[PDB]
Design an enzyme around this catalytic site. Sequence first.
Site, PDB file in Angstrom:
ATOM      1  N   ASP A 186     -15.087  -4.237  10.442  1.00  0.00           N
ATOM      2  CA  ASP A 186     -16.369  -3.771   9.987  1.00  0.00           C
ATOM      3  C   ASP A 186     -17.111  -4.821   9.160  1.00  0.00           C
ATOM      4  O   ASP A 186     -18.068  -4.457   8.466  1.00  0.00           O
ATOM      5  CB  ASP A 186     -16.188  -2.474   9.203  1.00  0.00           C
ATOM      6  CG  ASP A 186     -15.683  -2.706   7.797  1.00  0.00           C
ATOM      7  OD1 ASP A 186     -15.382  -3.863   7.398  1.00  0.00           O
ATOM      8  OD2 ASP A 186     -15.558  -1.717   7.065  1.00  0.00           O
ATOM      9  N   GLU A 220       0.838  -1.206   0.000  1.00  0.00           N
ATOM     10  CA  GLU A 220       0.000   0.000   0.000  1.00  0.00           C
ATOM     11  C   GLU A 220       0.869   1.250   0.000  1.00  0.00           C
ATOM     12  O   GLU A 220       0.518   2.260  -0.604  1.00  0.00           O
ATOM     13  CB  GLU A 220      -0.915  -0.006   1.245  1.00  0.00           C
ATOM     14  CG  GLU A 220      -2.059  -1.031   1.197  1.00  0.00           C
ATOM     15  CD  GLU A 220      -3.142  -0.687   0.212  1.00  0.00           C
ATOM     16  OE1 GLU A 220      -3.147   0.446  -0.333  1.00  0.00           O
ATOM     17  OE2 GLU A 220      -3.971  -1.596  -0.051  1.00  0.00           O
ATOM     18  N   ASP A 266      -6.204   8.572  -0.095  1.00  0.00           N
ATOM     19  CA  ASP A 266      -5.752   7.539   0.834  1.00  0.00           C
ATOM     20  C   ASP A 266      -4.465   8.034   1.518  1.00  0.00           C
ATOM     21  O   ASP A 266      -3.569   8.603   0.864  1.00  0.00           O
ATOM     22  CB  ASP A 266      -5.401   6.243   0.083  1.00  0.00           C
ATOM     23  CG  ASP A 266      -6.572   5.540  -0.553  1.00  0.00           C
ATOM     24  OD1 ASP A 266      -7.740   5.875  -0.369  1.00  0.00           O
ATOM     25  OD2 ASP A 266      -6.267   4.559  -1.268  1.00  0.00           O
ATOM     26  N   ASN A 274      -7.847   9.204  -5.114  1.00  0.00           N
ATOM     27  CA  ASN A 274      -8.683   8.258  -5.847  1.00  0.00           C
ATOM     28  C   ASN A 274      -9.511   8.995  -6.880  1.00  0.00           C
ATOM     29  O   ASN A 274      -9.699  10.213  -6.817  1.00  0.00           O
ATOM     30  CB  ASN A 274      -9.634   7.498  -4.911  1.00  0.00           C
ATOM     31  CG  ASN A 274      -8.920   6.857  -3.749  1.00  0.00           C
ATOM     32  OD1 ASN A 274      -8.016   6.083  -3.958  1.00  0.00           O
ATOM     33  ND2 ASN A 274      -9.309   7.198  -2.531  1.00  0.00           N
ATOM     34  N   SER A 295     -11.705  11.311  -3.262  1.00  0.00           N
ATOM     35  CA  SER A 295     -11.185  10.974  -1.964  1.00  0.00           C
ATOM     36  C   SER A 295      -9.670  10.766  -2.083  1.00  0.00           C
ATOM     37  O   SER A 295      -9.114  10.752  -3.170  1.00  0.00           O
ATOM     38  CB  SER A 295     -11.889   9.721  -1.406  1.00  0.00           C
ATOM     39  OG  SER A 295     -11.627   8.617  -2.248  1.00  0.00           O
TER      40      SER A 295
END
EC number: 3.2.1.17
Length: 129
Positions: A101, A35, A52, A46, A50
């Site tokens: 989640d 990552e 990251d 993105n 958004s």
Amino acid sequence: KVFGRCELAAAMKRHGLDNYRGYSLGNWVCAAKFESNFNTQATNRNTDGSTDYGILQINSRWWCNDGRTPGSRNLCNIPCSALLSSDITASVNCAKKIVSDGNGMNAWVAWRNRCKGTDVQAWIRGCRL
Ligand SMILES: [Cl-]
Ligand SMILES: [Cl-]
Ligand code: NA
């Protein structure tokens, strides 16, 4: 900060990520390697606008506030800049909420594509933990 591999492994272990929700340490180091190449200052934008952040590339669409992702949530209750610190605590605490989640570590695309189903224990071999 650009962590070394065993250095990161040891920091994650101290922060309770080893076997967290059943994911062995090697999974988390592997995910960080692909990552962010172990760089806490990594950012990437993105397509939806958004961004990251940080060593686990946590998305401002859902998890942190960067002031520029209209209509997004801030489920980790943190500014996204806190995810860029040399201190990984805020990234680890937020990753713990993400992996809890329901979707486990599939939330990390690089983990799904590059770590899942591999011998992730190679990522912590030789490290003193
Ligand atoms: Cl492992
Ligand atoms: Cl990928
Ligand atoms: Na947000």
